[PDB]
Enzyme design. Structure first.
Site, short mmCIF file in Angstrom:
data_model
loop_
_atom_site.label_atom_id
_atom_site.label_comp_id
_atom_site.label_asym_id
_atom_site.label_seq_id
_atom_site.Cartn_x
_atom_site.Cartn_y
_atom_site.Cartn_z
N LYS A 1 -15.09 -56.49 -0.07
CA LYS A 1 -13.79 -56.25 -0.33
C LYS A 1 -12.91 -54.70 -0.42
CE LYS A 1 -13.01 -61.02 -0.63
NZ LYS A 1 -12.07 -60.85 0.31
N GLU B 1 -3.32 -61.09 -4.54
CA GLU B 1 -3.63 -62.41 -5.07
C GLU B 1 -5.12 -62.42 -4.86
OE1 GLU B 1 -3.29 -61.70 -1.55
OE2 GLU B 1 -5.25 -62.44 -1.09
N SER C 1 -22.26 -60.06 2.04
CA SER C 1 -21.09 -59.80 1.71
C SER C 1 -20.83 -59.35 0.25
CB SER C 1 -20.02 -60.91 2.00
OG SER C 1 -20.16 -62.04 1.26
C1 LIG Z 1 -18.04 -61.85 -2.37
C2 LIG Z 1 -17.29 -62.60 -1.20
N1 LIG Z 1 -17.58 -62.83 -0.16
C3 LIG Z 1 -16.81 -63.60 0.96
C4 LIG Z 1 -15.55 -63.89 0.62
C5 LIG Z 1 -14.75 -64.63 1.31
O1 LIG Z 1 -13.64 -63.74 1.95
P1 LIG Z 1 -13.60 -63.65 3.53
O2 LIG Z 1 -14.06 -64.79 4.26
O3 LIG Z 1 -12.10 -63.08 4.00
O4 LIG Z 1 -14.52 -62.30 4.15
C6 LIG Z 1 -15.18 -63.73 -0.55
C7 LIG Z 1 -13.75 -64.09 -1.03
N2 LIG Z 1 -13.08 -63.71 -2.31
C8 LIG Z 1 -11.72 -63.83 -2.31
C9 LIG Z 1 -11.51 -65.16 -2.02
O5 LIG Z 1 -11.14 -66.01 -3.07
C10 LIG Z 1 -11.21 -63.38 -3.57
O6 LIG Z 1 -9.77 -63.23 -3.74
O7 LIG Z 1 -11.75 -63.12 -4.57
C11 LIG Z 1 -15.94 -63.15 -1.65
O8 LIG Z 1 -15.41 -62.53 -3.02
#
Ligand SMILES: Cc1ncc(COP(=O)(O)O)c(CN[C@@H](CO)C(=O)O)c1O
Ligand SMILES: O=P(O)(O)OC[C@H](O)CO
Ligand SMILES: [Cl-]
Ligand SMILES: [Cl-]
Ligand SMILES: [Cs+]
Lengths: 394, 269
Positions: A86, A108, A376
């Protein structure tokens, strides 16, 4: 009219109230401009290297693949500052906000991971950050909420609707519709209305670019397949992007299977949903037969988006990428397996991608295949959840 | 093709009157109570109706209407039941223009073209889709024109010239002129000398302009007509009276009557 195509085939678009269209057209022009600006790229590259920790490692997993002909590499986005991929795109989005003169940041969050990345990006770059989060998520992510608040951010619980992520997404766009002149909405995934799917992809595409360079270096060849979990599509399209024109490379996205596709309690709209219009885009969705948008389910709080990014739906339809699902139990087992054998605690989100890679390896153990899994995030946030599960059994 | 909007505006013009149009959510706080709320609104003097269909994610509505959807959702209301309501309302009031406030997914769900055919079958006059901007409207307005439904388009306060010429040419029935920015609510009022917007809307031969959002006082209905608008829409104000008098069904209708009587009276010559 826009400078860029808002559609990936039949998917995408800009389905927002008329009042928000100037905000979107402004964001697109800022993006196209910043993408041609070398001093924007220099600043972006510098925050990624010296603040975020890029490039991240590409770790080989000799232990987990022993006795088979699979070679498995992990793209270690878990080592990025913040603990998840992120961070990459919030730094770019926050630079975009300042480039437009914006002073505040709207965000959000569901698992809290995007909220934490938005907060840290705002603290670094001097932006006042307010974060919306469903009231059911706030009660369940008090660690991340505290981190967000520690980093100067305002956490606003949303009790509207079902008080989860889709309702926080609604409240952010409500906020943005009246405050867009001063504030920037920092969408957290490769979904939503154009230009966000394009912007979030281009701000996450260093994941795949580094993987290509690192695998050509270590193996002298491109991977047979890159595998990533898919909530909204941010981390998956980030890995896919630089490989889309390397047609020999497989693109596999893993959606959460929940308790099982058959049980209805899952979060796999791309393959087991129906195309609808919501969150400003035309995309597959979890919805009732009436057209009411329902919730996803997953053991993994990060895969709780009820829809998916339109570029993934497009890539599915032209057969360029493939999309599978992985149940909760399958993810927990992959989680356990990486802990014991490689000493890495993955996020329950990324455990889905790994669980499918283990399945490709185990179902055909004599298949020569070079696999890369996008890790991720790190799983320190999930050890409490994993604890309560196996306490309820053995 | 009925011309219920075209006629209402001609009549109101010959009486040098302004239009008052209340909004309510269908099935709030229940089908039967909603049916006689609409009957009280038409009886109290409403010139037209804008009716919302409860949607799970109303991203253009403030808290008041958000509560109305959940009150309606607690009652079992569905898009199917709403269309049975719209049919009954038309069977009771043949001439009043009925407009739907729709969110896109409910229209797109099982075919855009089938949704507009159902509206024509039940007597609906216009449809505004809250989350379909003019730039994405083509299949919606084309389906609406093919079924003699008027597509309603929001003209926001920040509109430039290309938008106004688009809104003027694509829209029929009436033009939704936004009072402010943001979402729904009687709380925030605050017009932005719409005078000039209304003039080039008239210059571009747009459909008559109704001002909406934040209209909660009869002085606003008067001011809007004097600015050039053909009338005013008020939603949360109506919805707030319903929300306040939930445990008093007979007093709910009584204040609903006295409010519409005030706003409608603010609209006449
Ligand atoms: C570690 C990790 N890996 C993957 C994802 C999935 O997001 P993506 O499919 O858009 O990459 C998330 C989602 N986290 C987002 C969705 O809730 C959030 O607002 O916190 C994540 O925290
Ligand atoms: O609630 P208002 O009066 O601000 O206006 C919104 C209406 O409910 C819908 O047009
Ligand atoms: Cl490093
Ligand atoms: Cl091996
Ligand atoms: Cs999902």
């Amino acid at each position: 009219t826009t400078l860029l195509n808002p559609y990936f085939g039949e998917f995408g678009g800009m389905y927002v109230p008329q009042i928000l269209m100037p905000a979107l057209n402004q964001l697109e022009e800022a993006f196209v401009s910043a993408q041609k600006d070398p001093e924007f790229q220099a600043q972006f590259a510098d925050l990624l290297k010296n603040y975020a920790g890029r490039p991240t490692a590409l770790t080989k997993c000799q232990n987990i693949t022993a006795g088979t002909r699979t070679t498995l590499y992990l793209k270690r986005e878990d080592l990025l500052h913040g603990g998840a991929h992120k961070t990459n795109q919030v730094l770019g989005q926050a630079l975009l906000a300042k480039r437009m003169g914006k002073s505040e940041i709207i965000a959000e969050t569901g698992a809290g991971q995007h909220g934490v990345a938005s907060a840290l990006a705002s603290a670094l770059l001097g932006l006042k950050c307010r974060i919306y989060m469903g009231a059911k998520d706030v009660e369940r992510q008090s660690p991340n909420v505290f981190r967000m608040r520690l980093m100067g951010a305002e956490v606003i619980p949303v009790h509207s609707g079902s008080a989860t992520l889709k309702d926080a997404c609604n409240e952010a766009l409500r906020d943005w519709s009246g405050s867009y002149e001063t504030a920037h909405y920092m969408l957290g995934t490769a979904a939503g209305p154009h230009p966000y799917p394009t912007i979030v992809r281009e701000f996450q595409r260093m994941i795949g670019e580094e993987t290509k360079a690192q695998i050509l270096d270590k193996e002298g060849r491109l991977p047979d397949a890159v595998i990533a979990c898919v909530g909204g599509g941010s981390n998956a399209i980030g890995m896919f992007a630089d490989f889309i024109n390397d047609t020999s490379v497989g693109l596999i996205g893993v959606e959460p299977g929940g308790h099982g596709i058959e049980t209805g309690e899952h979060g796999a709209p791309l393959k087991h949903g129906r195309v609808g219009i919501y969150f400003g885009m035309k995309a597959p969705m979890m919805q009732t037969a009436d057209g009411q948008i329902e919730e996803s389910y997953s053991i993994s709080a990060g895969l709780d988006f009820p829809s998916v990014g339109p570029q993934h739906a497009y890539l599915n339809s032209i057969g360029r990428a493939d999309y599978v699902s992985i149940t909760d139990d399958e993810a927990l087992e992959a989680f356990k397996t990486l802990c014991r054998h490689e000493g890495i605690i993955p996020a329950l989100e990324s455990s889905h991608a790994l669980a499918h890679a283990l399945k490709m390896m185990r179902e055909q153990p004599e298949k020569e295949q070079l696999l890369v899994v996008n890790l991720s995030g790190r799983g320190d946030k999930d050890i409490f959840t994993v604890h309560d599960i196996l306490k309820a059994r053995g | 093709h009925m011309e219920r909007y075209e006629n209402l505006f001609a009549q109101l013009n010959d009486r040098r009157e302004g239009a008052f149009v209340p909004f309510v959510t269908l099935g709030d706080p229940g089908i039967e109570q909603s049916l006689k709320i609409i009957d009280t609104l038409i009886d109290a003097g409403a010139d037209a109706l804008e009716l919302g269909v409860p949607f799970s994610d109303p991203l253009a509505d403030g808290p008041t209407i958000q509560n109305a959807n959940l009150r309606a959702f607690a009652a079992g209301v569905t898009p199917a039941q709403c269309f049975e309501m719209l049919a009954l309302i038309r069977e009771k009031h043949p001439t009043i223009p009925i407009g739907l406030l729709m969110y896109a997914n409910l229209v797109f769900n099982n075919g855009i073209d089938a949704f507009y055919a159902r509206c024509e079958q039940v007597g609906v006059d216009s449809v505004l889709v809250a989350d379909v901007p003019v730039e994405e409207s083509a299949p919606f307005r084309q389906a609406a024109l093919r079924h003699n439904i008027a597509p309603i388009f929001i003209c926001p306060p920040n509109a430039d010239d290309d938008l106004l010429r688009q809104v003027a040419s694509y829209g029929r029935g009436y033009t939704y002129l936004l009072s402010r920015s943001g979402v729904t609510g009687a709380e925030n009022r605050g017009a932005l000398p719409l005078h000039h917007l209304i003039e080039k809307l008239k210059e571009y031969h747009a459909a008559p302009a109704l001002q909406g959002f934040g209209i909660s006082s009869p002085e606003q209905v008067s001011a809007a007509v004097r600015a050039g608008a053909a009338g005013a829409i008020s939603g949360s104000a109506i919805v707030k009276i319903i929300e306040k008098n939930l445990a008093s069904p007979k007093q709910m209708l009584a204040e609903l009557r006295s409010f519409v009587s005030a706003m409608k009276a603010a609209s006449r010559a």
